[PDB]
Amino acid sequence: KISGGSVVEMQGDEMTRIIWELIKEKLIFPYVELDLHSYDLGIENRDATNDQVTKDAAEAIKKHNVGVKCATITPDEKRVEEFKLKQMWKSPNGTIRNILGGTVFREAIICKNIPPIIIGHHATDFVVPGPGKVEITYTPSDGTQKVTYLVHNFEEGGGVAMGMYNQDKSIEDFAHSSFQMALSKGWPLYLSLKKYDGRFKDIFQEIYDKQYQKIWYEHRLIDDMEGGFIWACSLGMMTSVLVCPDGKTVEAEAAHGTVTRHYRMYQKGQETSTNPIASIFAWTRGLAHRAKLDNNKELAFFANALEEVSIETIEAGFMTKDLAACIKGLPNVQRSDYLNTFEFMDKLGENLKIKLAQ
Amino acid sequence: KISGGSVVEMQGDEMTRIIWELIKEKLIFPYVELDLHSYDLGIENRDATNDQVTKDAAEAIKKHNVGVKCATITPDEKRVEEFKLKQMWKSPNGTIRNILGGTVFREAIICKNPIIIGHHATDFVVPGPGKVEITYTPSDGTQKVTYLVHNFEEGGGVAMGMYNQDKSIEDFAHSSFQMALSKGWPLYLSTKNTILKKYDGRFKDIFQEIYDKQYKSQFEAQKIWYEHRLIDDMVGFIWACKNLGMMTSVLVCPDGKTVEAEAAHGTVTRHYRMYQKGQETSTNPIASIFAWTRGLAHRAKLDNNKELAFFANALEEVSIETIEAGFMTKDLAACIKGLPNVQRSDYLNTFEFMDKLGENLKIKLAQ
Ligand SMILES: NC(=O)C1=CN([C@@H]2O[C@H](COP(=O)(O)OP(=O)(O)OC[C@H]3O[C@@H](n4cnc5c(N)ncnc54)[C@H](OP(=O)(O)O)[C@@H]3O)[C@@H](O)[C@H]2O)C=CC1
Ligand SMILES: NC(=O)C1=CN([C@@H]2O[C@H](COP(=O)(O)OP(=O)(O)OC[C@H]3O[C@@H](n4cnc5c(N)ncnc54)[C@H](OP(=O)(O)O)[C@@H]3O)[C@@H](O)[C@H]2O)C=CC1
Numbered sequence: 189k190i191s192g193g194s195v196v197e198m199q200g201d202e203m204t205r206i207i208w209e210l211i212k213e214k215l216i217f218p219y220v221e222l223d224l225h226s227y228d229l230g231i232e233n234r235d236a237t238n239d240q241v242t243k244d245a246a247e248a249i250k251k252h253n254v255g256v257k258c259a260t261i262t263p264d265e266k267r268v269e270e271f272k273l274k275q276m277w278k279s280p281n282g283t284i285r286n287i288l289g290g291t292v293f294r295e296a297i298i299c300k301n302i303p304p305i306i307i308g309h310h311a312t313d314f315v316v317p318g319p320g321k322v323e324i325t326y327t328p329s330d331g332t333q334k335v336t337y338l339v340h341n342f343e344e345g346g347g348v349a350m351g352m353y354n355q356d357k358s359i360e361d362f363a364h365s366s367f368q369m370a371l372s373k374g375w376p377l378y379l380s381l382k383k384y385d386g387r388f389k390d391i392f393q394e395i396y397d398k399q400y401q402k403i404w405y406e407h408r409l410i411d412d413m414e415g416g417f418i419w420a421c422s423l424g425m426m427t428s429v430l431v432c433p434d435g436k437t438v439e440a441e442a443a444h445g446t447v448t449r450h451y452r453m454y455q456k457g458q459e460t461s462t463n464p465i466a467s468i469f470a471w472t473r474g475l476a477h478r479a480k481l482d483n484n485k486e487l488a489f490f491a492n493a494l495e496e497v498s499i500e501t502i503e504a505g506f507m508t509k510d511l512a513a514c515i516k517g518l519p520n521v522q523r524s525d526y527l528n529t530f531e532f533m534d535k536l537g538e539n540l541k542i543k544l545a546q
Numbered sequence: 547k548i549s550g551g552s553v554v555e556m557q558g559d560e561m562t563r564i565i566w567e568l569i570k571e572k573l574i575f576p577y578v579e580l581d582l583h584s585y586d587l588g589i590e591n592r593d594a595t596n597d598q599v600t601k602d603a604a605e606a607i608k609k610h611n612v613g614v615k616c617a618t619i620t621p622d623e624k625r626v627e628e629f630k631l632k633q634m635w636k637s638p639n640g641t642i643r644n645i646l647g648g649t650v651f652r653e654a655i656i657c658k659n660p661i662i663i664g665h666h667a668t669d670f671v672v673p674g675p676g677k678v679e680i681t682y683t684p685s686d687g688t689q690k691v692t693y694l695v696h697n698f699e700e701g702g703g704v705a706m707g708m709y710n711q712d713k714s715i716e717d718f719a720h721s722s723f724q725m726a727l728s729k730g731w732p733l734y735l736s737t738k739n740t741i742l743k744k745y746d747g748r749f750k751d752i753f754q755e756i757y758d759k760q761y762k763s764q765f766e767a768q769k770i771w772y773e774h775r776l777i778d779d780m781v782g783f784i785w786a787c788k789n790l791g792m793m794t795s796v797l798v799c800p801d802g803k804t805v806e807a808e809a810a811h812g813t814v815t816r817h818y819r820m821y822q823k824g825q826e827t828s829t830n831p832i833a834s835i836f837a838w839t840r841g842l843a844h845r846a847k848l849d850n851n852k853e854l855a856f857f858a859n860a861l862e863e864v865s866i867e868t869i870e871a872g873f874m875t876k877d878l879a880a881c882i883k884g885l886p887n888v889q890r891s892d893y894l895n896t897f898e899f900m901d902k903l904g905e906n907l908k909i910k911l912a913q
């Protein structure tokens with residue numbers, strides 16, 4: 189068995205929780221040993237501990253550099269009645285992301301028989317009661333000049349206004365994180381309010397020509413945008429990853445939520461078909477990054493090999509129902525076209541046993 | 547021939563000009579008489595009269611309530627070279643949309659082989675450390691209220707200001723409420739007023755205030771409604787959002803009376819450079835067509851014109867069923883079979899397809 193190493197892991201809620209534990213038992217644990225830092229971010233325990241588990245996991249990823257997350261219920265009032273929650277806890281994803289910072293990257297996992305691009309996305313509001321000038325001024329620390337611009341002269345009635353700012357560090361971190369991400373994937377990077385979006389274009393060209401393999405970098409405009417490049421700005425085949433600026437810290441996760449409807453059938457006793465692929469690839473991306481930080485040739489191999497098996501299994505006709513309805517059309521799907529949740533996991537395990545045996 | 551009424555019409559540029567005249571000669575004029583208020587918004591005539599023609603149309607739509615516009619070249623430096631323009635004239639749409647006001651509505655046209663969305667700046671660069679503030683100074687010399695946008699203490703960056711008046715927000719409501727009632731469709735407003743508690747909050751409220759004071763009645767009167775949402779949770783309805791040869795843009799004035807319609811695609815220059823060269827083209831008229839039927843059907847409503855209203859409805863159907871039965875342009879055939887696999891016997895060119903819509907409009911109307 190591979191010594192993978194130190195990996196933070198957060199468990200979730202409902203249907204993705206069922207799949208999380210399956211992934212560990214049929215795909216991960218049987219081939220890899222981890223010095224595992226589990227945190228139980230299920231809604232019940234988050235409530236029980238006063239969203240404390242959530243803070244504890246986040247600091248761990250800050251400490252051990254690698255996190256993989258199971259999808260988690262975010263509370264609104266309907267949930268608060270359901271779990272009798274003592275408060276309406278903020279999303280753990282929000283909680284975690286502030287503590288760690290960085291930029292998210294959503295990659296669709298591409299299968300060859302279904303209908304890659306990595307997109308990475310990146311204030312003072314008030315009420316103007318009645319008429320009057322609303323201006324925005326800038327006064328440098330060395331008291332040399334006062335530059336004041338007029339946002340609008342309210343002559344009509346009143347209304348609403350707002351202010352928005354931005355420091356260089358934040359944009360430099362968009363750049364670093366985006367250029368670094370381009371080399372890890374070996375893909376070209378593209379970057380898509382005359383003077384606002386302009387300041388973005390520059391710091392990119394400046395970090396590019398200062399630190400940053402048969403690769404390059406370019407700029408564009410929204411509407412101007414074969415497939416296989418990094419772009420800076422079924423669901424169960426989406427994989428978002430939060431990349432911290434330093435380049436060391438990484439958190440991986442499914443891009444879908446907890447699939448409650450499938451879980452409600454699971455409870456009722458009915459047969460389901462939840463796509464594990466998103467949650468799966470959350471693990472392999474985190475494991476492969478662990479491998480990078482540790483120069484772990486054995487592990488790195490395993491990570492890629494499991495990403496392989498997953499794609500080859502669907503490419504071979506064995507798949508779940510969300511994928512079978514994407515190929516054939518929902519109303520035209522027969523039961524012998526897809527596998528259920530527990531059978532598709534069996535096939536991957538069987539193909540992972542064989543693929544890894546050779 | 548049906549008595550249509552008072553309708554402003556503006557001719558456009560390049561390929562949309564070719565298709566436009568095909569629409570009038572082969573689909574509209576042969577069945578409908580209009581008191582026609584043509585204005586020629588071609589880049590030349592706009593140049594020649596000093597974009598005057600453009601202003602004349604706006605006040606014309608402002609007067610007669612119903613307008614249909616053909617896609618029109620917007621000048622950039624390159625265009626000024628081609629035509630030797632005397633100036634780089636503002637978009638005709640920019641001009642016209644200022645004079646009339648209202649809210650644009652883009653509706654995607656569904657072929658079986660719909661959502662109506664209607665959407666709603668001062669930026670500068672912060673060189674080095676220092677405070678950027680945004681202030682409010684009332685007209686009645688009362689206190690001046692100062693908010694701090696941010697104190698940059700390390701280095702620089704960027705900042706910006708953004709506004710919105712109530713008149714602006716109140717006109718968003720109506721234009722969105724009118725369009726929902728015209729369509730017998732439910733209305734949803736997607737704000738982001740969790741983050742922006744005081745900004746979009748003003749949006750969310752002014753919407754719930756208009757709903758009651760005037761529109762809760764008539765909404766139940768068509769078993770329809772209105773609700774508010776937040777962007778990601780919103781993920782046959784009218785969608786208001788605080789922010790291709792089958793796309794149809796329509797400007798709804800708040801009053802409910804004035805309406806200007808047009809295809810959402812541009813002048814299709816590439817196909818036109820082929821047209822000039824003498825080569826065979828294949829451009830989609832449905833959008834340009836549907837502009838007419840939205841403006842004609844709006845005309846019919848204001849005037850109790852069952853004859854016109856049917857005809858409008860009848861033509862829109864002809865367009866959709868003509869494609870739903872397999873006769874289409876190349877952009878649509880490339881949607882079905884994939885771009886690299888498109889054979890010529892899959893699609894019709896511009897002049898064969900207009901023929902087919904015309905033929906089908908003869909038989910349909912015969913019934
Ligand atoms: N912490 C996190 O990472 C996130 C958490 N959430 C949470 O999800 C909870 C409710 O789930 P909800 O947002 O409504 O539903 P989902 O976000 O999980 O996805 C909605 C629909 O997409 C389909 N879907 C998504 N993933 C899969 C999959 N692996 N296999 C098959 N189908 C899939 C299902 O379609 P179908 O109808 O066919 O069954 C599902 O009903 C919320 O309480 C919210 O807090 C939301 C977003 C991310
Ligand atoms: N005043 C107005 O109403 C508007 C004016 N414009 C002006 O149009 C001019 C040029 O527009 P441009 O952006 O280049 O072209 P378009 O915006 O119209 O679209 C360009 C391409 O999109 C495809 N396309 C769009 N509509 C159709 C259609 N009906 N049938 C088939 N294909 C279509 C074509 O691709 P393909 O080549 O592969 O076939 C076409 O070459 C500009 O100067 C611009 O200012 C732009 C928007 C509205």
Ligand SMILES: Cc1cc(Cc2ccc(O)cc2)n(O)c(=O)c1
Nearest residue numbers: 411620637639640643810811812
């Ligand atoms: C100049 C201009 C153009 C459009 C339409 C448009 C279409 C395609 C495109 O790529 C960009 C603009 N409108 O609506 C305006 O008010 C003003």
